[PDB]
Amino acid sequence: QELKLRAIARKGIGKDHAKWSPAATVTFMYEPDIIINEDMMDTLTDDEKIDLI
Amino acid sequence: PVTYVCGDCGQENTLKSGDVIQCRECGYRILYKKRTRRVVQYEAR
């Protein structure tokens, strides 16, 4: 068996076909702000803290 | 040069008339048209 061919490679963008996209995955995420009220954290026994975590 | 092959052995017959459809070296009755040499263009899409 045999394969024999000639190809022409050009320039394009990913909006045209996904073969021209340079990104396998680009993403972002929001940065979070976490507050824990320690005056209500003392009210919990530690097995309930493990149950929360 | 349109030539045919035998689907059982592989002997390359050359039919140009319409007598019968049969091989010589086997006797079986199935033949394929051979792919000659030419370039076909495709998009890679």
Binding site: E2, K4, I8, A9, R10, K11 | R37, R45
Partner: protein
């Protein structure tokens, strides 16, 4: 452009596989699209618009 294919795969399978192989593209910001190039007809190797494989 396929000259000989004796494999058990068909030509659109092979062309779609070839379309998705990543090439080294640092020239892509400096070359032009093939709709804009007047220095050629496509159909071969030509700088600013085409590479032959």
């Amino acid at each position: 452009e396929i000259e000989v294919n004796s494999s058990v795969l068909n030509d659109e399978f092979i062309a779609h596989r070839l379309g998705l192989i990543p090439l080294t593209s640092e020239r892509a910001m400096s070359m032009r699209f093939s709709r804009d190039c007047d220095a050629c007809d496509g159909d071969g190797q030509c700088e600013f618009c085409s590479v032959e494989f």
